C-alpha cells in the first residue's frame, strides 16, 4: 500500500491534476451558488425550443 | 476596581496586568497564538491585536489601564488579526490532516479554526534550513517554525537552560541552539520545555513523529507530494480544516492521554502521557499541573522507554541452583510465603526485615509496613530515605516537628532569597531549579548556592561559595550567630513561635566568623556579606539536598539550617521556609506511610500507646513494641547473624548502600532474599526469588513529591506481560501469609491509610481526581495546608524549639586517602540508571560514568581526558574514566552514580553513618589516583549538554525582530 500511495501521489502531484481537482471543487461550489428554482422554467423553455428546432426536418 | 469597557459593555478589572488575561476570563475570542499562561507575553505573533484606547495594540502585552475601551469584533481589529495570522501561516505549511501535533491542541490549528480563515494572503515559503533531527528526543522543523518564540522564551525564562535564541538578524529568522550549533551538539538539557510550549509541530518530540495519527505514518517521500496536492486542490481552509478535525477525532481513539507523576525525582511533576498502545509517544505537561505546570526535565519527558524496555522482568524469577528460573506466579508466591513463615516461626518476626521503594506509590509503602507489622509483626522497614531524607526529617522533628517542605515550588519562586546548600538542584531536582532560575533571572531573586562542586546553578547563582566537605555546619552556625547577635534576626518571631533562643545562643558561643573562615576554607568577606543578605532578605527558602544531609553530622547541620531559618523567621511566611529536597518521587510519601522503622504511617512514633492501640484496632494484629533497625545497620546485624531474611522492593540497595562490598558479603551471608524490581538490577542478581515489579506508568497510586503534595496517578498501561503492580504483589504475598487483605483498587488502601494517618486525614481518591493534588498535612474536611507552620507549629506548645548542635567531625579517612571524591547524580541519568539507560536518547547523551576532575589537580597528578583511572578506598576499588572540567576544584572530584558495574562510586564509601539516623556519609569519600591508560575515548561525547555554550538573554528579544525592515506591525499595516 505504501508503494501504491507513492505512485498515486507522484503521478498526481503534477500541477495539472491539482488544478483539475481544484476546479472540479470550484465548479461544484459555483453550481451550488447558482439558484436552480428559477432555472426549471428555463429548462422547460429550452426543452420546447429544442423540440421546435428539431421539428424543422 | 479599574473599571473597563470591552465589546461596548462595562466590565471590571482584576489583578491581571494585560488585556489578554481579561479577554480570556471574559471568554472573548481573541486570537492568541504566541501567548502561553506560564510563558508570559512573548509578543512575537501579533495575532492578539485589539483596539485599546482606539489604537491597535497587542493585547498580550497591553497593560490593563483604567478606563480603556476594548473592541474585538471591529473590522479593523479583525483585519489586523487576519494579517498577523497570514504572516504566521507564511511560515507554517499547515498540513493539519497529516501532522502529528493535530491532536486538537495545536494553537495554530485552533486559532485558525476560530478565526474562520480560508486563505493566506502570503503563500507559505519554505525556509532554507532543514529539519534538525540531531537530537534523539525532539526535532525542530524550521519549515514549520512560525517564529512565535514560545520555545525560546521557555528555554530562556521558564527553564533558564538558555540554549535557545532566535537569529532575527538572519534573512529568514529561525530558532538556533547556542550559536546555531546542531541541537545534539548544543547545550540543550533536553528538558522538553520547547517541545511542550511550541504552538505548532515545529519543535516536537520524535516519539510523535510519524506515529501520532493514521495518515502521518506515511513516508515523507510519499507524504510531501500529497501535501502539495492538497495545497493545490482545496480552495478554502474551512473544509480541509473540518477534515483535519475528523483526523483529530481519529487520533483520539488510538491516542491514550492519561495523567501521571514522574517517578524519577521528588519534584513530582505531573503530566499526561500520550501513548499509542504500549509505546510512549509524548509526555505532554498541562498548565493545570500543580508541581510543574509545563515545566519538565529530560527524564520525565523523554526517559520513559524503560517501561517498554525488553529487559523488563515480565515473570517472577526464582533462584534455582545457580540461575534464575522463570517460574509461575502462584508457585513463587507459595515459595516466598512458606519461607517467610519458616523464618518467622523459627527465629521470630524480629529477624525479618523488609524494604519498600521510595520510587513506589504511597499504597506500596503502606502495604510494606502493614505486611511487616500487621502481618509479620516486625518493625524492620526502611527505604532510600535512610540514605536520603532520614537526617533532614530528623532535623525537622528536632526543630519544626513536621517533615517535608514548608511549602510548594510556587512558594520557592515567591521567595526573595533561596539558600541552597549541598544541592545539585539543576541536575537532581531539575524543575525546582528551573523555577529558582526563573525567579532569579526575571523576578530578581538572589540565591546563595553553597556546595563543593560548581554545577549549572552555582555558575548562575548570586553568591556561590564552596565550603569544605561537611563543613556546612560551621559557616552556617557562624552566620546564624552573626544574625542573632547584630539584631538582624526576627526577635518578634523568636518570642512568638520559637523556644530556647538563649540556650541556642549559648550553644553558639564557641562559633565565630573567623572560626568558620578557618574551618570551611572560605574568606570572611563572603560569609559576612551572605549573612547580611540573609538578614536583609524578607523571605528565605532554604534547600539542603544530600550534599549536606549525607554526612556524619548531616542531621546536626540539618537542624542547624532549620533553626537558622527559625532565627531569621521565615517559617509561616508565604513563600519562605525549609524545603529539604525529597529525592525520589515518593520518598516523602514513603516516609509519610511509616517507611522509617521508628515511626508509623501518619508520621507518628511507634513507641506511643495511642497510635499502637489505634493500629491494633484497625489491623487486628499487635504492633511490635521494639523499634526496627535502620537500613544501614541491617548489614552489620547480618554480619552478626541477627538478620536472616530481606524483602526489599524497588530499591537496589546492594549497589546504592555505602560499602557495597559489605552489602555483597551480607547478601552472600543471608539465607533467604526476595526482591521486587522491574529490571534485573544489581540487587535483583542476589535474591532467592525475584518478583517482577511494575513501573508507575503501569500502576495507579499516589505520589507525594518534595512539596508534600499527594498527587494521584493513572494506569497508563496494562502491566507488561503478566507482572503485577507492586501493591497487587504485596496483597498476594500477605494473603498467602494469612493477612486477608481485600483491595480491588488502590483507592481502598489510600482511604484506609488516610483514616489511619492524621496528616493524611483528608486525602481521598475522589479529592485527587485529574490534576487536583492535596498537600499533607490535610484535615478530615479536605482542606490541605499549602504552607506549613502557617499559624502554629505541631509541637504541644505550638512553638518550635532551636536544637543546640555543633560541628560533627567528618569521617574523612585521612592519610593516603588524599583526594576527596564526591558522589552525586547527573541530570540525564537516574542513579545507576536502571531506567534512563534503557532509553536510547539519554544513553547517547551520556553513555558511561565519568570522573570529573579539576584542572588544578590535572597538573600536579598529570591527568588528562578520556583516561581510565583507579580509585581505591578501604571499602572498594573502582576503575572510572576521566573528564576535564572546572566544575570541581582542587583535590575534590565528582563521581556521579550513573554506572552499575565496577565503576560505581559506592565501592569507595564506607560504613560510617550519622549518629542520629545512621545515614551513610556518601559525600565523605577519599581514595587514590592511579593512571592506567594515557590515551582513550572521552566518556563525555560532544553531543552531551555540558559541552555546549548557552546564550543568556532575557525573553525572545523581540525588539530585534521589530527592528527588521521587512517586519511590519499589523496594527499600523491596516491603518
Ligand atoms: C488527496 C487529495 C485530497 C483533496 C481534498 C479533498 C476534500 C476537499 C474538501 C471538501 C470539498 C471542499 C469544496 C466544497 O465543497 O466547497 C468549496 C467552497 C469553498 O469555500 P468558499 O470560500 O467558496 O465559501 C466558504 C463557505 O461559505 C463557508 O465555509 O466551500 C467550502 O469549502 C465549504 C465546505 C463545507 C464543509 C465540506 C462540505 C460538506 C458537504 C455536506 C456534507 C454533509 C454530511 C452529512
Ligand atoms: C473501473 C475501475 C474498476 C477502475 C479501477 C482503477 C481506478 C481508475 C481506480 C480509481 C483510483 C483513484 C482515482 C483513487 C483516488 C481515491 C482514493 C481511493 C484515495 C485514497 C488515497 C489517499 C490516502 C488519499 C488522501 C486522503 C486524505 C484525506 C488526505 C489528507 C489530505 C492532506 C494531506 C491534507 C494536508 C493539509 C493541507 C495541505 C492544508 O492546506 C490544510 C489547510 C487547513 C487545514 C488542514 C490542511 C491539511 O490538512
Ligand atoms: S535523594 C535523590 C534522589 S532519590 C534523586 N536522584 C536523582 C535525581 N536526579 C537525577 N537526574 N538522577 C538521580 O539519580 N534527583 C534526586 O536527587 C536526590 C539527591 O540529589 P542531590 O541534589 O542531593 O544530588 P547530588 O548528590 O548529585 O548533588 C549534591 C551536591 O552536593 C554538593 N556537595 C557534596 N559534598 C558536599 C559537602 O560536603 N558540602 C556541601 N555544602 N555540598 C556538598 C555537590 O556539589 C553535589 O553536586
Ligand atoms: N555513593 C552514593 N550512594 C548513594 C547515594 C549518594 O548520593 N552517593 N544516594 C543514596 C540515595 S538518596 C538513594 S535514592 C539511593 C538510590 O537508590 P534507590 O532509591 O534504590 O534507587 P535506584 O536504584 O535509582 O531505583 C531502585 C530500583 O527501583 C526500580 N523501580 C523503578 N520504578 C519502580 C516502580 O514503580 N516500582 C518498583 N517496585 N520498582 C521500581 C528500578 O528498576 C531500580 O532498579 O542511592 C543511595 N546511595
Ligand atoms: C423560396 C424560399 C423557401 C425557403 C424555405 C425555408 C424552409 C421553410 C420550411 C421550414 C421547415 O419546416 O423545414
Ligand atoms: S502544526 Fe498545527 S496547524 Fe500546523 S499542520 Fe500541525 S496541526 Fe496543523
Ligand atoms: S533545554 Fe532543551 S528541551 Fe529544554 S527548552 Fe532548551 S532546547 Fe528545549
Ligand atoms: S519552534 Fe519555537 S519559535 Fe518556532 S513555532 Fe515552535 S514554539 Fe514557536
Ligand atoms: S523534574 Fe523530576 S519529577 Fe519533574 S519531570 Fe523531571 S524527573 Fe520527573
Ligand atoms: S499573544 Fe500577543 S502577539 Fe502573540
Ligand atoms: Mo534518594
Ligand atoms: S530517596
Is the CB of B473 inside a 6 Å radius of any atom of ligand 3?
no
Q: Nearest CB to A10: which of B225, B232, B235?
A: B225
* Helices and strands in chain A, H and E counts: 3, 0
B200 labeled binding residue: no
Q: What distance in Å separates the CA atoms of residue B365 and residue B464, rounded to the nearest whole number?
A: 38
Q: Which helix (H) or strand (E) holds B646?
A: strand B645-649
- Residue B121 burial by CB count (10 A; 0-12/13-18/19+): exposed, middle or buried? exposed
CA of B215 to nearest chain A CA: how many angstroms apart?
Answer: 11
> Going by C-beta distance under 8 Å and a sequence separation of 6 or more, which residues neighbour residue B206?
B133, B135, B136, B137, B138, B139
List the beta strands (DSSP E) in chain A.
Answer: none
Nearest chain B residue to A12 by CA distance is B229
Is the CB of B241 inside a 6 Å radius of any atom of ligand 2?
yes
Q: Nearest CB to A22: which of B222, B228, B235?
A: B235
CA of A34 to nearest chain B CA: how many angstroms apart?
Answer: 18
Is the CB of B21 inside a 6 Å radius of any atom of ligand 10?
no
Q: What is the dihedral of CA B96, B102, B107, B113, to 10 degrees?
A: 50
> Going by C-beta distance under 8 Å and a sequence separation of 6 or more, which residues neighbour residue B586?
B266, B268, B358, B359, B360, B361, B362, B364, B365, B703, B704, B705
CA of B221 to nearest chain A CA: how many angstroms apart?
Answer: 8
Angle made by CA atoms B884, B889, B895, in degrees to the nearest 5: 60
C-alpha cell at B32: 492568541
Q: Nearest CB to B218: which of A5, A13, A19?
A: A5
Q: What distance in Å separates the CA atoms of residue B271 and residue B257, rounded to the nearest whole number?
A: 9
Q: Which residue's C-alpha cell is 497564538? A: B33
Is the CB of B242 inside a 6 Å radius of any atom of ligand 1?
yes
**CA nearest neighbour of B771 among B381, B258, B71, B418:** B258
Strand partners, B450: B421, B465
Q: Ligand nearest B261 Cα, by number?
A: 9
> Which chain B residues touch A25 with a CB distance below 8 Å?
233-235
Do the strands B498-499 and B800-801 form a parallel or antiparallel pair, or are they unpaired? parallel
> Going by C-beta distance under 8 Å and a sequence separation of 6 or more, which residues neighbour residue B15?
none
Angle made by CA atoms B702, B355, B432, in degrees to the nearest 5: 45
Nearest atom within ligand 9 for CA of residue B297: 6
> Going by C-beta distance under 8 Å and a sequence separation of 6 or more, which residues neighbour residue B582?
B266, B388, B389, B404, B405, B588, B705, B706
Q: What distance in Å separates the CA atoms of residue B968 and residue B519, rounded to the nearest whole number?
A: 62
Q: What distance in Å separates the CA atoms of residue B875 and residue B662, rounded to the nearest whole number?
A: 8
- SS3 label, residue B444: coil
Cβ B391 vs Cβ B596: under 8 Å: no
B99 labeled binding residue: yes
Q: Which residues line ligand 9 (CB under 6 A)?
A: B 262, 264-265, 267-269, 292, 296-297, 299-301, 430-431
Q: What distance in Å separates the CA atoms of residue B477 and residue B465, rounded to the nearest whole number?
A: 15
Cβ B58 vs Cβ B81: under 8 Å: no
Q: Which helix (H) or strand (E) holds B433?
A: helix B430-438
**B143 Cα to the center of ligand 2, angstroms:** 23
Q: Nearest CB to A6: which of B222, B228, B234?
A: B222
**CA nearest neighbour of B688 among B676, B705, B700:** B676
Nearest chain A residue to B232 by CA distance is A18
- Pairs of residues, one from chain A and one from chain B, whose beta carbons lie less than 8 Å apart: 41
Nearest chain A residue to B219 by CA distance is A2
> Which chain A residues touch B226 with a CB distance below 8 Å?
5, 9
Cα B397 vs. chain centroid, distance in angstroms? 25
Sheet containing strand B709-712, edge to edge, reads: B702-704, B709-712, B773-775
C-alpha cell at A56: 424543422
Q: Which helix (H) or strand (E) holds B261?
A: strand B256-261
CB–CB contact B228 A18 (8 Å): yes
> Going by C-beta distance under 8 Å and a sequence separation of 6 or more, which residues neighbour residue B175?
B140, B142, B145, B147, B151, B152, B164, B165, B166, B194, B202, B203
Cβ B490 vs Cβ B571: under 8 Å: no
Cβ B939 vs Cβ B182: under 8 Å: no
C-alpha cell at B162: 538558555
C-alpha cell at A22: 481544484
> Which chain B residues touch A2 with a CB distance below 8 Å?
218-219, 222
CB–CB contact A9 B232 (8 Å): no
Nearest chain A residue to B217 by CA distance is A2
C-alpha cell at B18: 494585560
| B232 Cβ under 8 Å from any chain A Cβ | yes
Q: Which residues have a C–N gap over 2.5 Å right after them in chain B?
A: none
Cβ B173 vs Cβ B961: under 8 Å: yes
Q: Ligand nearest B832 Cα, by number?
A: 4
C-alpha cell at A1: 500500500
Crossing angle of helices B513-520 and B472-485, in 10° steps, is 160
Cβ B160 vs Cβ B460: under 8 Å: yes
C-alpha cell at B505: 545562643
Q: What distance in Å separates the CA atoms of residue B448 and residue B455, rounded to the nearest whole number?
A: 13
Cα B728 vs. chain centroid, distance in angstroms? 27
> Going by C-beta distance under 8 Å and a sequence separation of 6 or more, which residues neighbour residue B730?
B364, B367, B368, B371, B649
| A2 Cβ under 8 Å from any chain B Cβ | yes
Exposure pattern of B587-609 as b/e (b: 16+ CB <10 Å)?
A: bbbbbbbbbbbbbbbbbbebeee
B45 labeled binding residue: yes
Q: Give B47-76 as a 3 state SS string.
A: CCEEEECCEEEECCCCECCCCCEEECCCHH
**B34 Cα to the center of ligand 8, angstroms:** 9
| B242 Cβ under 8 Å from any chain A Cβ | no
Mutate to test the interface with B, among A1, A4, A5, A20 (most CBs of B within 10 A): A5
C-alpha cell at B31: 486570537
Neighbours of B766 (CB within 10 A): 10
**B707 Cα to the center of ligand 6, angstroms:** 37
Residues 197-226 of B with CB under 8 A from A: 218-219, 221-223, 225-226
Q: Which residue's C-alpha cell is 490549528? A: B109
Neighbours of B100 (CB within 10 A): 21
> Going by C-beta distance under 8 Å and a sequence separation of 6 or more, which residues neighbour residue B515?
B474, B478
Q: What distance in Å separates the CA atoms of residue B676 and residue B692, rounded to the nearest whole number?
A: 6
Exposure pattern of A2-32 as b/e (b: 16+ CB <10 Å)?
A: eeebbeebeebbeeeebeebbeeeeeeeeee
Nearest atom within ligand 6 for CA of residue B102: 7
CB–CB contact B235 A26 (8 Å): yes
Q: What is the dihedral of CA B684, B685, B691, B694, to 10 degrees?
A: 50
> Which chain A residues touch B221 with a CB distance below 8 Å?
6
Is the CB of B948 inside a 6 Å radius of any atom of ligand 7?
no
B34 labeled binding residue: yes
Q: What distance in Å separates the CA atoms of residue B730 and residue B732, rounded to the nearest whole number?
A: 5
Q: Ligand nearest A32 Cα, by number?
A: 1
Q: What distance in Å separates the CA atoms of residue B49 and residue B60, rounded to the nearest whole number?
A: 8
Cβ B279 vs Cβ B656: under 8 Å: no
Q: What distance in Å separates the CA atoms of residue B36 and residue B34, rounded to the nearest whole number?
A: 7
Q: What distance in Å separates the CA atoms of residue B2 and residue A38, rounded to the nearest whole number?
A: 59
> Which chain B residues touch A13 with a CB distance below 8 Å?
225, 228-229
**B693 Cα to the center of ligand 12, angstroms:** 18
CA distances from B604 to B401, B593, B607, B615 (A): 11, 9, 9, 11
Strand partners, B323: B320
Exposure pattern of B464-493 as b/e (b: 16+ CB <10 Å)?
A: bbbbbbbbbbbbbbbbbbbbbeeebbbeeb
CA quadruple B936, B939, B945, B946: dihedral positive or negative?
A: negative
Cβ B422 vs Cβ B451: under 8 Å: yes
Q: What distance in Å separates the CA atoms of residue B672 and residue B263, rounded to the nearest whole number?
A: 29
Neighbours of B856 (CB within 10 A): 13
Q: Give B151-195 as a 3 state SS string.
A: HHHHHHHHCCCCCEEECCCCCCCCEEECCCECCCCCCCCCCCHHH
Is the CB of B89 inside a 6 Å radius of any atom of ligand 2?
no
> Going by C-beta distance under 8 Å and a sequence separation of 6 or more, which residues neighbour residue B824?
B424, B427, B428, B453, B546, B547, B894, B895, B896, B897
Supply the DSSP symbol for B374: I
Phi, psi of B260 (to 5 degrees): -155, 175
**CA nearest neighbour of B330 among B312, B318, B319, B320:** B318
* B277-281, Cβ contacts within 8 angstroms, sequence gap of 24 or more: B278/B308, B278/B717, B278/B720, B279/B207, B279/B211, B279/B308, B280/B207, B280/B304, B280/B305, B280/B307, B280/B308, B280/B697, B281/B205, B281/B207, B281/B208, B281/B211, B281/B212, B281/B255
| A5 Cβ under 8 Å from any chain B Cβ | yes
CA of A30 to nearest chain B CA: how many angstroms apart?
Answer: 12
Q: What distance in Å separates the CA atoms of residue B591 and residue B356, rounded to the nearest whole number?
A: 10
> Which chain A residues touch B238 with a CB distance below 8 Å?
none
Is the CB of B46 inside a 6 Å radius of any atom of ligand 10?
yes
Q: Ligand nearest B919 Cα, by number?
A: 4
Q: Nearest CB to A21: which of B221, B226, B233?
A: B233
Q: What is the dihedral of CA A43, A47, A49, A51, to 10 degrees?
A: 180
Is the CB of A57 inside a 6 Å radius of any atom of ligand 5?
yes
CB–CB contact B229 A13 (8 Å): yes
Q: Which helix (H) or strand (E) holds B9?
A: strand B9-11
- Residue B621 burial by CB count (10 A; 0-12/13-18/19+): exposed, middle or buried? middle
* B236-245, Cβ contacts within 8 angstroms, sequence gap of 24 or more: B236/B118, B236/B119, B237/B94, B237/B112, B237/B117, B237/B118, B237/B119, B238/B116, B238/B118, B240/B96, B240/B97, B241/B96, B241/B109, B241/B112, B241/B113, B243/B97, B244/B96, B244/B97, B244/B99, B244/B102, B244/B109, B245/B104, B245/B113
* Helices and strands in chain B, H and E counts: 34, 38
Cβ B627 vs Cβ B379: under 8 Å: yes
> Which chain A residues touch B229 with a CB distance below 8 Å?
9, 12-13, 17-18, 21
Q: What distance in Å separates the CA atoms of residue B223 and residue B228, rounded to the nearest whole number?
A: 9
| A43 Cβ under 8 Å from any chain B Cβ | no
Cα B80 vs. chain centroid, distance in angstroms? 42
Sheet containing strand B55-58, edge to edge, reads: B9-11, B4-6, B69-71, B49-52, B55-58
Cα B759 vs. chain centroid, distance in angstroms? 23
Strand partners, B866: none
Q: How was this model experimentally determined?
A: cryo-EM
Amino acid at each position: 500500500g505504501d508503494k501504491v500511495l507513492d505512485i498515486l501521489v507522484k503521478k498526481a502531484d503534477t500541477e495539472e491534476t491539482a488544478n483539475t481537482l481544484k476546479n472540479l471543487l470550484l465548479l461544484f461550489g459555483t453550481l451550488g451558488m447558482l439558484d436552480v428554482k428559477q432555472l426549471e422554467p428555463l429548462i422547460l423553455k429550452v426543452n420546447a425550443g429544442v423540440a421546435s428546432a428539431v421539428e424543422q426536418k | 476596581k479599574k473599571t473597563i469597557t470591552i465589546n461596548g459593555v462595562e466590565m471590571e478589572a482584576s489583578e491581571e496586568q494585560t488585556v489578554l488575561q481579561l479577554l480570556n476570563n471574559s471568554s472573548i475570542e481573541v486570537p492568541q497564538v504566541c501567548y502561553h499562561p506560564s510563558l508570559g507575553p512573548i509578543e512575537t505573533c501579533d495575532t492578539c491585536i485589539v483596539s485599546i484606547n482606539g489604537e491597535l495594540k497587542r493585547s498580550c502585552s497591553a497593560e490593563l489601564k483604567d478606563g480603556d475601551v476594548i473592541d474585538t469584533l471591529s473590522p479593523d481589529v479583525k483585519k489586523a488579526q487576519v494579517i498577523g495570522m497570514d504572516k504566521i501561516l507564511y511560515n507554517h505549511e499547515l498540513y493539519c490532516t497529516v501532522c502529528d501535533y493535530n491532536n486538537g491542541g495545536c494553537e495554530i490549528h485552533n486559532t485558525v479554526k476560530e478565526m474562520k480563515i480560508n486563505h493566506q494572503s502570503i503563500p507559505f515559503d519554505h525556509k532554507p534550513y532543514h529539519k534538525d533531527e540531531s537530537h534523539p528526543f525532539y526535532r525542530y522543523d524550521p519549515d514549520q517554525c512560525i517564529l512565535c518564540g514560545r520555545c525560546v522564551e521557555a528555554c530562556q525564562d521558564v527553564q533558564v537552560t538558555e540554549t535557545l535564541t532566535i537569529d532575527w538578524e538572519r534573512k529568514r529568522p529561525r530558532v538556533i541552539w547556542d550559536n546555531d550549533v546542531p541541537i545534539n551538539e548544543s547545550s540543550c538539557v533536553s528538558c522538553g520545555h520547547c517541545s511542550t510550549v511550541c504552538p505548532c509541530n515545529a519543535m516536537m518530540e520524535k516519539g510523535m513523529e510519524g506515529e501520532a495519527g493514521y495518515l502521518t505514518g506515511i513516508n515523507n517521500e510519499t507524504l510531501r507530494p500529497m501535501i502539495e496536492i492538497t495545497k493545490g486542490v482545496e480552495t478554502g481552509y474551512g473544509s480541509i480544516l473540518a477534515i483535519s478535525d475528523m483526523e483529530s477525532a481519529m487520533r483520539d481513539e488510538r491516542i491514550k492521554k492519561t495523567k501521571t507523576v514522574c517517578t524519577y525525582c521528588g519534584v513530582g511533576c505531573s503530566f499526561d502521557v500520550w501513548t499509542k498502545g504500549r509505546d510512549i509517544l509524548k509526555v505532554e505537561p498541562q498548565e493545570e499541573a500543580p508541581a510543574n505546570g509545563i515545566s519538565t526535565c529530560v527524564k520525565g519527558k523523554f526517559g520513559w522507554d524503560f517501561v517498554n524496555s525488553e529487559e523488563r522482568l515480565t515473570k517472577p524469577l526464582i533462584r534455582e541452583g545457580d540461575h534464575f528460573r522463570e517460574a509461575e506466579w502462584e508457585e513463587a508466591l507459595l515459595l516466598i510465603a512458606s519461607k517467610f513463615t519458616e523464618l518467622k516461626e523459627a527465629f521470630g518476626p524480629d529477624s525479618l526485615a523488609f524494604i519498600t521503594s521510595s520510587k513506589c506509590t504511597n499504597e506500596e509503602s503502606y502495604l510494606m509496613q502493614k505486611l511487616a507489622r500487621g502481618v509479620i509483626g516486625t518493625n524492620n522497614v526502611d527505604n532510600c530515605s535512610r540514605y536520603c531524607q532520614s537526617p533532614a526529617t530528623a532535623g525537622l522533628f528536632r526543630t519544626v516537628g513536621y517533615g517535608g517542605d514548608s511549602g510548594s515550588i510556587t512558594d520557592i519562586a515567591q521567595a526573595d532569597l533561596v539558600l541552597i546548600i549541598g544541592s545539585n538542584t539543576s541536575e537532581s531536582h531539575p524543575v525546582l531549579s528551573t523555577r529558582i532560575k526563573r525567579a532569579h533571572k526575571l523576578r530578581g531573586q538572589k540565591v546563595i548556592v553553597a556546595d563543593i562542586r560548581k554545577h549549572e546553578m552555582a555558575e548562575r547563582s548570586d553568591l556561590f561559595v564552596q565550603p569544605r566537605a561537611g563543613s556546612d555546619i560551621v559557616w552556617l552556625n557562624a552566620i546564624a550567630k552573626y544574625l542573632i547577635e547584630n539584631g538582624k534576626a526576627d526577635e518578634r518571631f523568636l518570642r512568638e513561635r520559637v523556644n530556647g533562643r538563649d540556650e541556642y545562643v549559648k550553644s553558639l558561643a564557641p562559633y565565630t566568623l573567623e572560626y568558620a573562615e578557618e574551618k570551611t576554607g572560605i574568606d570572611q568577606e563572603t560569609l559576612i556579606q551572605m549573612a547580611e543578605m540573609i538578614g536583609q532578605a524578607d523571605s528565605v527558602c532554604a534547600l539542603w539536598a544530600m550534599g549536606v544531609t549525607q554526612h556524619i553530622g548531616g542531621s546536626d547541620t540539618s537542624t542547624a539550617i532549620s533553626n537558622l531559618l527559625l532565627v531569621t523567621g521565615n517559617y509561616g511566611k508565604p513563600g519562605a521556609g525549609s524545603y529539604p529536597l525529597r529525592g525520589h518521587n515518593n520518598v516523602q510519601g514513603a516516609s509519610d506511610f511509616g517507611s522509617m522503622p521508628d515511626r508509623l504511617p501518619g508520621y507518628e512514633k511507634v513507641t506511643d500507646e495511642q497510635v499502637r492501640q489505634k493500629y491494633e484496632r484497625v489491623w487486628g494484629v499487635p504492633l511490635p513494641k521494639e523499634p526496627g533497625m535502620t537500613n544501614h545497620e541491617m548489614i552489620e546485624k547480618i554480619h552478626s547473624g541477627q538478620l536472616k531474611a530481606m524483602y526489599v522492593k524497588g530499591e537496589e540497595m546492594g549497589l546504592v548502600d555505602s560499602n557495597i562490598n559489605h552489602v555483597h558479603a551480607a547478601y552472600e551471608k543471608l539465607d533467604f532474599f526476595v526482591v521486587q524490581d522491574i529490571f534485573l538490577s544489581r540487587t535483583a542478581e542476589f535474591a532467592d526469588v525475584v518478583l517482577p515489579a511494575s513501573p508507575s506508568l503501569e500502576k495507579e497510586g499516589t505520589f507525594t513529591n518534595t512539596e508534600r503534595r499527594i498527587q494521584r496517578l493513572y494506569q497508563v498501561f496494562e502491566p507488561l506481560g503478566e507482572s503485577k503492580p507492586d501493591w497487587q504483589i504485596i496483597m498476594e504475598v500477605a494473603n498467602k501469609l494469612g493477612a486477608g487483605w481485600l483491595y480491588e483498587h488502590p483507592a481502598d488502601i489510600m482511604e484506609e491509610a488516610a483514616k489511619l494517618s492524621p496528616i493524611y486525614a483528608g486525602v481521598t481518591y475522589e479529592r485527587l481526581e485529574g490534576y487536583n493534588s492535596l498537600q499533607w498535612p490535610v484535615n478530615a474536611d479536605g482542606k490541605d495546608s499549602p504552607l506549613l507552620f502557617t499559624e502554629r507549629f505541631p509541637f504541644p506548645d505550638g512553638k518550635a524549639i532551636l536544637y543546640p548542635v555543633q560541628w560533627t567531625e567528618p569521617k574523612e579517612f585521612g592519610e593516603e586517602y588524599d583526594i576527596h571524591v564526591n558522589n552525586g547524580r547527573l541530570l540525564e541519568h537516574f542513579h545507576e540508571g536502571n531506567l534512563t539507560y534503557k532509553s536510547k536518547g539519554i544513553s547517547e547523551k551520556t553513555p558511561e560514568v565519568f570522573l570529573e576532575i579539576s584542572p588544578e589537580l590535572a597538573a600536579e597528578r598529570g591527568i588528562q581526558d578520556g583516561t581510565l583511572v583507579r580509585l581505591t578506598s578501604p571499602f572498594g576499588n573502582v576503575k572510572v574514566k576521566c573528564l576535564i572540567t572546572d566544575r570541581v576544584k582542587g583535590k575534590e572530584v565528582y563521581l556521579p552514580m550513573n554506572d552499575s558495574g565496577e565503576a560505581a562510586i559506592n565501592l569507595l564509601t564506607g560504613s560510617h553513618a550519622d549518629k542520629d539516623t545512621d545515614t551513610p556519609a556518601y559525600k565523605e569519600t577519599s581514595a587514590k589516583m592511579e593512571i592506567l591508560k594515557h590515551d582513550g575515548i572521552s566518556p563525555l561525547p560532544k553531543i552531551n549538554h555540558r559541552n555546549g555554550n548557552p546564550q543568556p538573554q532575557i525573553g525572545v528579544q523581540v525588539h530585534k525582530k521589530w527592528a527588521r525592515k521587512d517586519y511590519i506591525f499589523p496594527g499600523d499595516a491596516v491603518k
